[PDB]
Design a protein around this ligand. Structure first.
Ligand SMILES: Nc1ncnc2c1ncn2[C@@H]1O[C@H](COP(=O)(O)NP(=O)(O)OP(=O)(O)O)[C@@H](O)[C@H]1O
Ligand SMILES: Nc1ncnc2c1ncn2[C@@H]1O[C@H](COP(=O)(O)NP(=O)(O)OP(=O)(O)O)[C@@H](O)[C@H]1O
Ligand SMILES: [Ca+2]
Ligand SMILES: [Ca+2]
Ligand SMILES: [Ca+2]
Ligand SMILES: [Ca+2]
Ligand SMILES: [Ca+2]
Ligand SMILES: [Ca+2]
Ligand SMILES: [Ca+2]
Ligand SMILES: [Mg+2]
Lengths: 937, 920
DNA sequence: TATGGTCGGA
DNA sequence: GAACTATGGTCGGA
RNA sequence: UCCGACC
RNA sequence: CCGACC
């Protein structure tokens, strides 16, 4: 099997030395990383090579790393450190805390070295990380799982090494390497059980974009493992057994093994475990809800009911504010949505499953097969916008195409004019701008994560937070240009997103989980939408929808019928179901199926009730799709059929399960064409300006089949794609990229395409006009306050020569740091900033005056008086010459100086808030409008 | 009463010739200053300053008067000088307060006058039509007052009352160069005299003529106009002479109601209905009293004019003679302005021709609903109609116990962590009002004046309530205060309850016992949240509630036909009698119903039919005399009509001044119905009718005096006996045996013990080594340097002096804030190269220099054991700075020095506290 | 040259 | 009179 | 940016 | 404490 590649695959993984054998897995994982990052061989015998008993009882990785850095070889900057909370859990928490599992992850990139006896792939072990748990991690232990991002062996990229590219069997060798046998790492033997497309990933600069694949490995055996439950005291278990426990293969040999394999993802879905129902509490339905017109169509695909008590515990376990009307989760073999039974008057727990939910035949015996696992809940809704895919369909199903082009166009101009007229007004008053910046972006996540506002050097990392921080210390956005420049860039970027993606905001629109009406109250083509709270659009708001038409759609939208106009009817029967949209269970075909072959197992619909967009819309009847069986080759080989090659009984089953793995790995590594065929359709439809003619329809079918590839077992290669383009699509093979893909109009004449018209005839003009009005509406870097300490020390320096020397050294040192500030490198923008900052913080007084300036009793010397003087000098010397340097390095001190300077006797008191307490305060809107009222009179 | 009259000859300040040419505003402000400084306005070189006419700040006018007070806001003066007294719908108000003159000397004014500053109130129809400058309002002590304070001159001589009324009504009163005639008077309630409480009456005056007025339009350019004509403009007396003149008098308030003018509808756009909606059962009962429909476009304008966030579903306002509520027509498919009026709304026959009688005037809009509670009037009625009285008691009591425990448990858990306690303190009280008013957190000395803010200020700088005793003691004091408030007042709060505007079903969708409630946003109870009410029984009631039928149980049905109507409750127009009438005789002109959907409170309720009310005609006599009858005395024609109108004013002023018995008769019913423990027996129903009629006194012309009250008690009640206060009116159970009345039981058997139990129920210390950082820092320097040591010693001694002063003024005892400030001034007095570093002159605020920190540090070090409250009240500010500095760790974030204003505008983020508390 | 969309960053 | 004796509720300002 | 689920 | 409202 291509022996050239096989040799370079002998030792890709780092070796585990005997000295590290008696180590906690976390310690083993972390220690190995530093060695790799420091170039030191783990088996190097020059070093002492003795285990430090002190490592077995640690809480910060820095302590473990420091003991090694004492050795000369390690003594380079430290690599990213596992957060202490994660580290403690790995050693003392059994890898699980609050439903979160520590994850062992790696990124593998091809070795630049082309030496024949050299590792084919260079390995980077990622720091221990906390991630949501899943069924398999909860059942067999989060430490028994290892995931990697490996470059796809079938990548047609120039950057691919030649050993693999030239060798014909190269693909088979790597695939065999992954699946044939165990892989050794940190004292554990890992076996592959699953693989999925990770998409195009940028090769790590530590070692041109290449498609990478995520492979999942289970720890079958380890040195600490025992033959036939804590982490370091687990029992051997073969992947063939784990998959059997998950899928119950005995009762599922009739499934196509490729599809069987794809259901392993259901054991890996990130979920919160809620509760374990008893067998007598579970209602397994034998038949799905069926069309009342005898078409046989299923009307409740993927959705079933759940008791009110089950919903209540969902709220209690997840700490929700209210009881969720519906949740997305997994239950044994069931995957889909569950909705509260509006008819439940009791307090008994019960949940039902339906055929369309149950993806394999399951017995629901083990506790873990009867635990309701929640992946998400129906929450408060946001306003949504449009996307490039709805636009042609909206234009194609319009009674008047011209009226639509104007309607959507007007939405764009008036949304932009609001966005700017609001920011321009706020910029006049600092309190109003602070409110706007918090309303623009929310950093609550990073604030909770760090327990403080994250700060890069001397200013907050986020530009939004930087603005608020400096304004909170007294800076006026229209008086200091540093703040203006930040608001300018932020506005330009938000406009650039509108230019590059045309996300035209529609206030009367949202994405809502789709649910079917179990109770037959909604007639065909009626939907029910009730909100949990007031849904606001400009000067109109809603708690429900009634007596009006709505537009529903799903992405991707390709067929003319992928958008559908229906009638919003509020049924008081359903009133308690909030933040979900309920399709009727009457009619020939479920409405969800009409939305791009959608269902009710987690699907979210685009819901739009904007009249100017809805009433021009006319429905299209679902299209008659072409037979593409000649090109789309389906592999329906069953598990049973695979087993016949080997026999019957345990060993035969066990062999067949490993066949399923490697066979599915091969099918999972086939080059994907969903991207190409989708982009081809965009170009062809654009050139013909048609999303409804014959070629447009077939391509919509092709992309509709390709997206379901891994679950339908569809083989599709370059050859078939070129064949389909010749036989059915008119022989054109390479089509021109559309004009909207470019940032400026490179077309001839007035734009003809709706996207081109909106991007170049409506958006870019309006963007440029509003930006100039915003510039015209708006300042000086200089601020006499920020130089108070300079003037104060110069005066002392003039009177005293002793102080003069310190001033000169400080000034000269600052210039050196500015020189360093003055380019892309392996070390990124943050690391470069920190290095310049470290020299900046290095400037130090280096005696009564020195003590008064250094204030060494303060632990954080960035809070002493010397820091205030150093920043003041820097501002005076480089406010104009280099503004970014004086601020990114001295902003926090300059803010302190401003708040000191702006304080007036008697008029209140400034407040030095702790980082943490500051990071937990939000602007009070009600305070803002009342204060502005007091100013108007 | 000759003695009273001689004292009534010269009540008002005199208008000298030198101020004749002065603008009204200037004259009023000058008069106020001279009175405040006690200077006669009628031989010094007091001469007109032409600078005053062009003035834009009253202080500039006042500055010119330096030859030897509260100030109108500058925007008001400008609107008064150059804005025609009207700005943005606000009208500048000429207000005065009168009080009995202390001196009893005869030939001296009976009343002492104080002109209040010029001020903004919302305008009304009358000010918008004839001009705010022509309106003057006074709070005067009632002549029919039995108070001991009433001066003997009035009390001892009867007939003084008639004289005081004659002074007010007979003719004009000269003030600031204008002739003022009384036109209206209403009860202002008991009001404390400015330097013992007495009942005062609001009297309204209109300027008929003046020095600047023209015989038959800027402020100084008015035209003569008699009150008899203004009222005739408002009420169209020619077409309303059929009305009882007292009721007609009562309608003058409609012209004085503070309202926001929205739009002026044209005559074609007005739909006057000749008949009200009536019962489908033939009773003849009105089912839409006070309520009509309006177009969606008129509603959208109300949002635009009032700056509302959404279109209101219903408004309370006045349109010509129409008073009441208007609701959006859910069936309005058009875009044309239209409004409708019904007989019940129209309190007089108006022609709807003048624009001011065709303007829609809004007082209030249906708005976001707030959770309510059970007032003490509802509890007896709930028990009277309870299927099982013992289960009602059990529920309301068990609910109360659960609520108290939840609150106490929340406070205790919060203290454990500073971020959580900050959230509880903010939830406890809101300082937004003080913050917006001062643009900062108000500070007394070195710490915020409010204890609640002081805790947040010091926790925001790193202090821990569990680790610093100063924070601990403040929190304990605050908790005790809340517990003491809870013991005094029994406030049972029910989350699933709210007061909501009552509307009627024009569209005939609701049945007799069905109501519809949709909310504008999520109504949150701790357990659940609602956007609407469906498939549950609710209780509806109105305050006052006295009769057993005054609370009713209905079925909440959500009708998609009414879905657009939000923040309102809609009653049925079907049935014999309207539901609103059952709630203390309620209507839909702005009545708000108490709505409860709490199943525990609702489930036991059994509805009672409306009672047959006794005939109290013997004690309650109504004056139904009509305007015509009044006119028949004077004849026919304009002149007769003119003095009939002035007669109505004088007769009504007397009626309006009749001592009111609503308070006492209500208090008596409470005391008697408590002794009887019955709100449904003979006397309770008697007293409910009595108070049910007394509230409608002014509109029904009911005469009721001590004599009638004495004989009503004598015959129908237990007369002449002074009824005691119920036990629950006291803070403790001074009664015999275990309490039995529902209120005594809930306050004394349920609330008191639970509150007391929490009150009965390594650690906190004054010391904090971080706070002595600067002191220890300067002792090291002082040990190796003399000059500094002398500075340190002098400073250390100087704080000693201030500490002694704090004992002299703040330890025990002109007012307390002044004393604290006096020490603070002495404290900030303590002040000094090295001196230049310690005292940063470039800082205007010396409290921000390094010296302020050292002085705070040594003061803490030297007196944290002995004088804690001194150290903090003077230096808490700097101690918080020091704490924030010391707690900062290299790389663990950056502290933020916030300004006072930007600090005062920030708020605890509930989402942060909850998320951070999770993950420890 | 190889898709769109919804969420989160335990 | 020494002593009798002044309502509930909804919302806003200061 | 990047990382991670989901349809 | 001041102001409308039922
Ligand atoms: N990567 C993707 N890009 C675009 N669309 C996607 C993608 N993944 C899923 N979808 C959409 O989600 C649909 C898949 O539906 P499901 O996720 O429900 N899978 P389904 O075929 O129904 O099989 P089951 O698991 O339910 O037995 C596709 O047809 C697409 O519409
Ligand atoms: N000061 C008050 N104290 C107690 N209850 C009051 C008070 N003012 C009004 N009310 C209540 O509101 C009712 C008055 O209703 P209205 O204000 O509707 N007057 P009404 O007699 O109907 O005459 P119209 O002007 O509507 O023709 C009283 O019966 C009480 O229930
Ligand atoms: Ca599908
Ligand atoms: Ca689906
Ligand atoms: Ca599905
Ligand atoms: Ca009323
Ligand atoms: Ca009424
Ligand atoms: Ca994607
Ligand atoms: Ca009152
Ligand atoms: Mg009534």
């Amino acid at each position: 099997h291509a022996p050239v590649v096989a040799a370079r695959l002998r030792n890709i993984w780092p070796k585990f030395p005997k000295w590290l054998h008696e180590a906690p897995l976390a310690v083993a994982w972390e220690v190995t990383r530093l060695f790799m990052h420091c170039k030191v061989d783990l088996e190097d015998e020059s070093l002492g090579l003795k285990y430090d008993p002190s490592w077995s009882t640690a809480r910060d990785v820095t302590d473990i790393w420091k003991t090694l850095y004492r050795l000369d070889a390690f003594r380079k900057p430290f690599p990213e450190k596992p957060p202490n909370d994660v580290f403690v859990t790995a050693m003392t928490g059994n890898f699980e805390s609050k439903g979160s599992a520590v994850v062992l992850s790696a990124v593998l990139d091809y070795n630049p070295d082309n030496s024949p006896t050299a590792p084919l792939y260079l390995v980077k072990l990622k720091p221990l990380m906390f991630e949501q748990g899943c069924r398999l991690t909860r059942r067999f232990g989060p430490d028994r799982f290892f995931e990697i991002l490996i470059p796809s062996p079938t990548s047609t990229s120039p950057s691919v090494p030649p050993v693999v590219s030239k060798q014909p069997g190269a693909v088979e060798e790597v695939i065999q390497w992954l699946t044939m046998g165990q892989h050794s790492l940190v004292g554990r033997q890992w076996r592959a059980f699953f693989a999925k497309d990770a998409g195009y990933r940028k090769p790590l600069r530590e070692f041109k974009p290449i498609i990478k694949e995520r492979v999942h490995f289970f720890a079958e055996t380890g040195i600490t493992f025992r033959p036939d439950e804590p982490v370091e005291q687990r029992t051997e278990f073969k992947v063939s057994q784990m998959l059997d426990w998950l899928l119950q293969l005995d009762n599922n040999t009739w499934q196509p093994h490729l599809k069987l394999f794809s259901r392993i993802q259901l054991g890996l879905s990130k979920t919160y475990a809620i509760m374990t129902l008893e067998p007598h509490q579970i209602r397994h339905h034998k038949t799905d809800l069926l069309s009342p017109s005898g078409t046989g169509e299923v009307m409740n695909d993927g959705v079933g009911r759940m008791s009110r008590s089950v919903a209540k515990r969902i709220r209690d376990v997840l700490g929700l504010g209210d009881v969720p009307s519906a949740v997305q989760g997994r239950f044994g073999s069931a995957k889909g949505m569950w909705v509260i039974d509006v008819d439940d008057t009791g307090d008994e727990d019960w949940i039902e499953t339906y055929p369309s939910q149950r993806k394999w035949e399951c017995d629901f015996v083990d506790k873990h097969q009867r635990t309701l696992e929640v992946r998400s809940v129906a929450s408060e809704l946001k306003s949504a916008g449009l996307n490039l895919q709805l636009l042609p369909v909206l234009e194609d199903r319009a009674r008047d195409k011209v009226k639509m082009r104007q309607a959507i166009g007007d939405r764009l101009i008036n949304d932009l004019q609001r966005q700017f007229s609001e920011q321009k007004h706020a910029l006049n008053r600092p309190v109003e701008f602070r409110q706007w910046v918090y309303e623009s972006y929310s950093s609550r996540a990073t604030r909770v994560s760090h327990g403080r506002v994250p700060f890069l050097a001397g200013l907050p990392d986020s530009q939004e937070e930087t603005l608020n921080f400096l304004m909170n210390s007294g800076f006026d956005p229209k008086k200091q240009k540093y703040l203006q420049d930040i608001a300018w860039d932020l506005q330009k970027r938000k406009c650039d997103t509108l230019k590059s993606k045309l996300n035209i905001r529609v206030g009367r629109s949202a994405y809502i989980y789709m649910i079917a009406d179990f109770w037959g109250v909604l007639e065909e083509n009626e939907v029910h939408v009730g909100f949990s709270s007031k849904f606001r659009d400009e000067e109109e708001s809603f708690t429900l929808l009634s007596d009006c038409d709505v537009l529903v759609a799903r992405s991707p939208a390709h067929f003319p019928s992928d958008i559908q106009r229906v009638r919003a009817v509020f049924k008081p029967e359903l009133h308690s179901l909030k933040d979900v949209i309920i399709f009727s269970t009457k009619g020939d075909v479920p409405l969800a199926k009409k939305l791009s072959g959608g269902d009710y197992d987690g699907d979210m619909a685009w819901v739009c009730w904007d009249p100017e967009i809805v009433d021009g819309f006319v429905n299209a009847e679902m299209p008659l799709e072409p037979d593409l069986s000649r090109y789309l080759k389906k592999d329906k080989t069953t598990f049973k059929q695979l087993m016949a090659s080997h026999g019957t009984g345990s060993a035969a089953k066990e062999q067949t399960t490993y066949d399923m793995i490697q066979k599915s790995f091969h099918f999972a590594l086939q080059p994907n064409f969903l991207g190409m065929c989708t982009n081809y359709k965009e170009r062809l439809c654009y050139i013909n300006n048609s999303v409804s003619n014959k070629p447009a329809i077939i391509l919509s079918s092709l992309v509709g089949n390709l997206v379901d590839q891994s679950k339908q077992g569809i083989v599709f290669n370059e050859a078939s794609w070129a064949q389909l383009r010749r036989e059915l699509l008119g022989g054109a093979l390479s089509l021109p990229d559309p004009m909207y893909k470019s940032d400026s109009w490179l077309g001839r004449g007035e734009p003809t395409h709706i996207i081109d018209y909106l991007k170049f005839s409506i958006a870019r003009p309006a963007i440029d006009k509003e930006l100039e009005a915003f510039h015209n509406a708006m300042a000086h870097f200089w601020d006499p306050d920020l130089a108070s300490y300079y003037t104060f020390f110069k005066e002392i320096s003039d009177k005293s020569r002793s102080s003069a020397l310190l001033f000169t050294t400080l000034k000269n040192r600052i210039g050196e740091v500015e020189k360093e500030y003055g380019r892309d490198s392996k070390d990124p923008y943050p690391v470069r900033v920190n290095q310049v900052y470290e020299k900046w913080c290095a400037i130090t007084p280096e005696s009564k005056v020195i003590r008064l300036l250094e204030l060494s009793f303060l632990a954080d010397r960035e809070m002493n008086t010397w820091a205030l003087l150093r920043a003041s000098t820097a501002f005076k010397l480089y406010y104009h010459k280099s503004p970014k340097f004086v601020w990114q390095m001295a902003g926090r001190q300059l803010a302190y100086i401003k708040a000191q300077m702006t304080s007036r006797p008697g008029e209140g008191a400034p407040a030095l808030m702790t980082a943490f307490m500051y990071a937990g305060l939000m602007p009070d809107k009600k305070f803002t409008k009342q204060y502005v009222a007091r100013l108007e009179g």
